[PDB]
Amino acid sequence: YVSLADLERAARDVLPGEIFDFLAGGSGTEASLVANRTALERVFVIPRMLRDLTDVTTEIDIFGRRAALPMAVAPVAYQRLFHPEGELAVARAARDAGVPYTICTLSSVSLEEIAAVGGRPWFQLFWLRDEKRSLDLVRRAEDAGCEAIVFTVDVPWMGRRLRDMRNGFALPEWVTAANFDFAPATWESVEAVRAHTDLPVVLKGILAVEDARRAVDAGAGGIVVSNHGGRQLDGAVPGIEMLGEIVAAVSGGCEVLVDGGIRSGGDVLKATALGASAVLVGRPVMWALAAAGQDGVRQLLELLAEEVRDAMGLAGCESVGAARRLNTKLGV
Amino acid sequence: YVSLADLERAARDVLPGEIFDFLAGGSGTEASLVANRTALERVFVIPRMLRDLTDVTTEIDIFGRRAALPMAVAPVAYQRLFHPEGELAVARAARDAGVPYTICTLSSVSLEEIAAVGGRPWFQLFWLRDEKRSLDLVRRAEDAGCEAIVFTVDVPWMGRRLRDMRNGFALPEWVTAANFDFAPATWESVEAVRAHTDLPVVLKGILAVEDARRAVDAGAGGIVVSNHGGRQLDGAVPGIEMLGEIVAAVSGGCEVLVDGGIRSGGDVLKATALGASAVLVGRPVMWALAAAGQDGVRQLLELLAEEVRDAMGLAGCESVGAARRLNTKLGV
Amino acid sequence: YVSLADLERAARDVLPGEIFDFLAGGSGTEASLVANRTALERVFVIPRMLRDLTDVTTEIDIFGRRAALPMAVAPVAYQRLFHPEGELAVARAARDAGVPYTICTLSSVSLEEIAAVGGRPWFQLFWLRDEKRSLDLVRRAEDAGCEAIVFTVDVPWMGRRLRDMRNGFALPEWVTAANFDFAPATWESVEAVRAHTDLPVVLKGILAVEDARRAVDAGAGGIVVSNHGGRQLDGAVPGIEMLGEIVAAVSGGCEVLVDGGIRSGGDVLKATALGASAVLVGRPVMWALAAAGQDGVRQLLELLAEEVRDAMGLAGCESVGAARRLNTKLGV
Amino acid sequence: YVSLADLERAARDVLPGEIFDFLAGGSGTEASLVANRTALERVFVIPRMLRDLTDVTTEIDIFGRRAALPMAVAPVAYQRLFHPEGELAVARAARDAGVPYTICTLSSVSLEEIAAVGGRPWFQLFWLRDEKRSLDLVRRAEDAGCEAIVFTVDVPWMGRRLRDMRNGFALPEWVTAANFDFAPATWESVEAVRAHTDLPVVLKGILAVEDARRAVDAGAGGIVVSNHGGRQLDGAVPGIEMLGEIVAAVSGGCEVLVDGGIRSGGDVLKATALGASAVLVGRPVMWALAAAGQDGVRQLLELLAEEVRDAMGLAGCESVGAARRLNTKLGV
Numbered sequence A, B, C, D: 001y002v003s004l005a006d007l008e009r010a011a012r013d014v015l016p017g018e019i020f021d022f023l024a025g026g027s028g029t030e031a032s033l034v035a036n037r038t039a040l041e042r043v044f045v046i047p048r049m050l051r052d053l054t055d056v057t058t059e060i061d062i063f064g065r066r067a068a069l070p071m072a073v074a075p076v077a078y079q080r081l082f083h084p085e086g087e088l089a090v091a092r093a094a095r096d097a098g099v100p101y102t103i104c105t106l107s108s109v110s111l112e113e114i115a116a117v118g119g120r121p122w123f124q125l126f127w128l129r130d131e132k133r134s135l136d137l138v139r140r141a142e143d144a145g146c147e148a149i150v151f152t153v154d155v156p157w158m159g160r161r162l163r164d165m166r167n168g169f170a171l172p173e174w175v176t177a178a179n180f181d182f183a184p185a186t187w188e189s190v191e192a193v194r195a196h197t198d199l200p201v202v203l204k205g206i207l208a209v210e211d212a213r214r215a216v217d218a219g220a221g222g223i224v225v226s227n228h229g230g231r232q233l234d235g236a237v238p239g240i241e242m243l244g245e246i247v248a249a250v251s252g253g254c255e256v257l258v259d260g261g262i263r264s265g266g267d268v269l270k271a272t273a274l275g276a277s278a279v280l281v282g283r284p285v286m287w288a289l290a291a292a293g294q295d296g297v298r299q300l301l302e303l304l305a306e307e308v309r310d311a312m313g314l315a316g317c318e319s320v321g322a323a324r325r326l327n328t329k330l331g332v
């Protein structure tokens, strides 16, 4: 594999069509899904030359820990849909690559089993029908060693996934929500979580500048600027199009991550040049899992690491902080 | 049916080609017809998160009455072209969905019969060869219980519909203008109508900011910002591209509706975020009528209601007024 | 025929390929040829409603004479390439339609024969190897009753027409330059012409704002804002993209015409809304001549007249002057 | 051959696929390779008319010598890949056309042999693992009569050329680096070169305005604004998009060349109108070499000379300096 697109071809071959569609699809007409790619393709980097590259490092510090790249595995529910080892395969590869892995509320292996793999696990929260149960998942995650709570704030309910409707898609009987034996979140829910944990709370799914500012005021340790991979509001702006304005409004008050359509180390460089602290990567990780299990995810992360180091050095950046100081130009 | 595009496929199968072309076509090269869709596809919404969605309502108050959605059925002449029950099928479905239905001057069932269905009928006026006859249709509509006069102001004559010319299209003998046993309108005609009725007068086909302002000064209760579905001047700007500037110039002085290419609840959300009070929907209603009669229109309106509620909630809007306060960003 | 595009299809059928290519082609990669169409397609008109249309007139006064439309036939060399009656067929149709016809220096029938047809003949000048001969053609044109001298200023030499090179195109022996038994023009050549005639001198091929201003200072009665149909500099900006800036800089000091890609009455409306006094139309007139001779040109001009009247009225314009006061908006 | 595109078709026929891919390809997704062409296609020239063209000259003075066109042959490694005479064929054609030829560090014929051909040889430097060896190549080039040192500053290492990876491309045994029996460059390396030679030092691969300014401060005699033909950072902005801003920031302090996608004399005109002193041309020269050896390169340079003279005169420019004063407009 020499690009992330090699892995998509491989995953399309192996997966059942309805599972590939559950993975690939977006809501509505898929306008926001396509726009995430369009938006990144319009960004061009203005590289710098002739800088010292003797010790190029792709490492960052985030939420108290070093990470090997400015990247984490995005939360993706039900990873046993894609490979029998599901989340354990992905978490082991992420641990070995030094990349944080986001354990999902709707994981198909329990959060404690995935946390026991080690590494830097974060935990993604969906707000449940009652405050006490929500907070119990948060406490389980914290007890299990998760390092951050990634509270998804863009899913008061699931979007209209027309591929899934047309396919009549349902979970196979062999895939379950292993953390179990949902409700719209509000700013009150954020405060309940913030009061219940010492872990940093990261709000995933922020697009309005005013919501990024309120996230900082609310005590969030980070936000993920994101339209949920085009799976929630069809017509929501891409996160990459709001990122620069959000980074300026936040003034360093929290970490600002972005996701949606990151498909290469050059895309990671674009996101960092627009001001991101780090990116999330979703679908490509599942392509690698589907294609070749744990080893596939390892190969994907090795390729991304090579592409990030290559792009940074070609752009004159010995560190991720230098990459954040790059300028960009929109093209056509 | 899971999108409005499902209904177009269904209507193309059933209708005779020349009738499908009368419905689908525009004037000239169809540049304005295509632009209505291009323009909406360029608009992206910036959704808000974490707001109270306990009682999301899609209802509005307009021209004195509650409507279940910020939407009305646009005037479309000669609906018996599409189904034998014609206007009565559409009006019954609109009534049952709580959506206003616009009765046309060129309806193929008399305005009194369609008004007797109940619901919230509006009446669309074409200016006739003489003031007294025009005003008689207005008085008939008012006597029959219509709630608003939708005066079409963009048809001094019919545009050049090249599909119809190439097809040699003419009305079948079984379709007639049932209100009967035309001239360019002017601002004088508007005043004659305004003086002849206590109903709100809504000018349909306004695109210039100065004409929206004059409409308010003339005592209009509303305007529809519209290029007539691309059927009148080929090269006329889409209404959606003038809407924001018109809403700002009107300063709340009248209701500002828009039409042209609304094909989903997400498009309704875009129109409201640009400042519309409500939209009109034309061709999709006729697709549903052609595909499945009254039940088809009911299914279309149920689908649109679900899509509007979904889009509003995903965008953090518990009411249409909140949706009007959303910001937008143009994309590519 | 219901559009000008019907005539292009007809002309492609009848003409030999190399003659169709001489007509259709541009220089280089044909980027400027395509851009003339792209540019017009990007312009949208903001029409006005509710104005008095009791006496819509498409007439203008230009260079001292009434014309039936804001349009003249562009200079096109060697019209016997397209039909045996060549220029006489086109000039007769233009006369009968009330449209000025531009007689070319390289006409395949003598300028005196074409002038004898009557109508409103203008005369297009190419600057010859010597001032005295150039001025003799000007004097011949004036003696023959031509009303304006259209001095082509964008042909110091012919552009690189790769279709013609690839085809090895040459004039058939049956087509000749009938005014005969060339050099780069300069501002000195313009003054020599201006001093030699009382007719208005119109500089065809102006694109720079500074050249439009100098044309007025030099005593030109008009300019044609034009990239020569994409046949001269490949990469020259379309005239329609410079027109508004040129109209503002000229401040009424001369007539400002435009050409390049006018293919409908709606395109004439766009040009007038951007400030043109009138347009030239080139290739479509030759399509009609090739398809059906004099009667073909008559049908083309009747169609254009109908399309111009339709577009003007739909845009609320009772006169060409009102159309020049329309606003426009660029789209995608 | 009537366009440079004729030569590409010819070269694709003759070369082995993997060698054609080594020549044609870029890094990553080839976004920057495509953007170099997109960017030039968006630029339109505003030509001037009616100027004196009695003695149009395409000549420039650069780095102390007259050149026949505002163009030099870009450095392209390993030219024996394309034809058995390799660099000697290209250098002989460049000499005979009066065009500077850039001898590469990785030439497949020694720099002294290519310099002995005569003409105006420049020498391109890659920074080697140690300062003394780098400086020895510089001294060899100077001793051999090269006129300028073109220091490549955008290759701390080679980009990720996925065509080459997929093809498993390697140099045939019959092609070698004939100057031999590499390390990231820095501003310190530039100063070491500048101190070691009296020749002008030209930094190739500058895109950031701040790096152009620093190049002047560092004593560079020129820069080449360039993304390395899309072969280095995938996503680097095209040089043509940074050129105008760089020319303004440099204020005449050094020569400012550009490369990337120049494929016609009209493209040379666009580059000069945006402010370039001269362009480099890479791939087309190798197409001509592959198609027909020395004579092919001669034909390419004759065609480019004709296209540059044609474009300049059609734009009203008697000299390259006048072409630099042309204005441009971006189109779509």
Ligand SMILES: Cc1cc2nc3c(=O)[nH]c(=O)nc-3n(C[C@H](O)[C@H](O)[C@H](O)COP(=O)(O)O)c2cc1C
Pocket (backbone or CB within 6 Å): A022, A023, A024, A036, A074, A075, A076, A077, A104, A105, A106, A124, A152, A204, A226, A227, A228, A229, A230, A231, A259, A260, A261, A262, A280, A281, A282, A283, A284
């Ligand atoms: C199959 C699938 C399942 C997902 N499940 C979740 C989830 O449980 N929680 C969440 O916050 N995001 C979920 N996401 C959204 C991702 O975290 C991410 O925002 C999105 O996929 C955009 O990134 P991409 O283009 O790299 O895939 C899911 C995405 C996919 C494709």
Ligand SMILES: Cc1cc2nc3c(=O)[nH]c(=O)nc-3n(C[C@H](O)[C@H](O)[C@H](O)COP(=O)(O)O)c2cc1C
Pocket (backbone or CB within 6 Å): B022, B023, B024, B036, B074, B075, B076, B077, B104, B105, B106, B124, B152, B204, B226, B227, B228, B229, B230, B231, B259, B260, B261, B262, B280, B281, B282, B283, B284
């Ligand atoms: C077949 C057809 C007939 C129409 N008849 C009328 C009419 O009688 N009066 C009117 O004001 N608009 C008429 N319209 C215009 C519509 O009210 C509406 O402005 C237009 O179709 C744009 O909406 P759409 O894209 O949703 O179809 C007609 C449109 C169609 C397609």
Ligand SMILES: Cc1cc2nc3c(=O)[nH]c(=O)nc-3n(C[C@H](O)[C@H](O)[C@H](O)COP(=O)(O)O)c2cc1C
Pocket (backbone or CB within 6 Å): C022, C023, C024, C036, C074, C075, C076, C077, C104, C105, C106, C124, C152, C204, C226, C227, C228, C229, C230, C231, C259, C260, C261, C262, C280, C281, C282, C283, C284
């Ligand atoms: C076949 C042909 C011959 C032309 N000959 C002349 C000419 O002799 N003199 C001139 O000034 N323009 C000449 N033109 C340019 C036209 O007058 C006009 O500027 C151009 O065709 C753009 O208009 P169009 O897109 O309507 O064709 C010629 C154009 C064509 C296609």
Ligand SMILES: Cc1cc2nc3c(=O)[nH]c(=O)nc-3n(C[C@H](O)[C@H](O)[C@H](O)COP(=O)(O)O)c2cc1C
Pocket (backbone or CB within 6 Å): D022, D023, D024, D036, D074, D075, D076, D077, D104, D105, D106, D124, D152, D204, D226, D227, D228, D229, D230, D231, D259, D260, D261, D262, D280, D281, D282, D283, D284
């Ligand atoms: C096959 C190939 C080899 C090249 N080798 C070199 C090189 O050794 N040194 C260098 O500075 N640039 C090298 N370049 C870059 C060119 O000098 C030039 O920047 C680039 O090809 C863009 O120009 P074009 O679009 O005209 O090809 C190479 C380009 C190609 C295609």
Ligand SMILES: O=C(O)[C@@H](O)[C@@H](F)c1ccccc1
Pocket (backbone or CB within 6 Å): A077, A078, A106, A155, A157, A158, A159, A228, A231
């Ligand atoms: O995008 C997604 O699939 C998730 O965020 C969530 F909405 C979801 C989880 C599991 C099944 C369907 C939906």
Ligand SMILES: O=C(O)[C@@H](O)[C@@H](F)c1ccccc1
Pocket (backbone or CB within 6 Å): A039, A040, A042, A043, A240, A241, A242, A244, A330
């Ligand atoms: O409004 C802005 O500045 C940004 O959204 C815009 F430039 C942008 C478009 C596409 C990708 C990233 C940024």
Ligand SMILES: O=C(O)[C@@H](O)[C@@H](F)c1ccccc1
Pocket (backbone or CB within 6 Å): B077, B078, B106, B155, B157, B158, B159, B228, B231
């Ligand atoms: O767009 C339309 O069809 C209507 O507004 C009107 F112009 C019209 C009604 C009936 C037949 C033809 C045209």
Ligand SMILES: O=C(O)[C@@H](O)[C@@H](F)c1ccccc1
Pocket (backbone or CB within 6 Å): B039, B040, B042, B043, B240, B241, B242, B244, B330
């Ligand atoms: O001029 C403006 O602000 C609007 O017309 C423009 F942004 C726009 C383009 C396309 C859809 C809606 C709006």
Ligand SMILES: O=C(O)[C@@H](O)[C@@H](F)c1ccccc1
Pocket (backbone or CB within 6 Å): C077, C078, C106, C155, C157, C158, C159, C228, C231
């Ligand atoms: O565009 C054109 O064909 C004319 O303006 C002129 F350049 C010309 C006339 C006759 C033959 C070739 C060229």
Ligand SMILES: O=C(O)[C@@H](O)[C@@H](F)c1ccccc1
Pocket (backbone or CB within 6 Å): C039, C040, C042, C043, C240, C241, C242, C244, C330
């Ligand atoms: O620069 C400007 O204002 C005009 O050239 C531009 F808007 C334009 C683009 C395309 C067609 C007409 C005008």
Ligand SMILES: O=C(O)[C@@H](O)[C@@H](F)c1ccccc1
Pocket (backbone or CB within 6 Å): D077, D078, D106, D155, D157, D158, D159, D228, D231
């Ligand atoms: O673009 C290129 O091929 C050159 O600049 C250089 F990176 C290179 C030279 C020779 C082989 C591979 C790469």
Ligand SMILES: O=C(O)[C@@H](O)[C@@H](F)c1ccccc1
Pocket (backbone or CB within 6 Å): D039, D040, D042, D043, D240, D241, D242, D244, D330
């Ligand atoms: O930012 C600018 O002014 C230039 O990069 C831009 F206009 C440009 C786009 C494409 C080609 C050359 C220039």
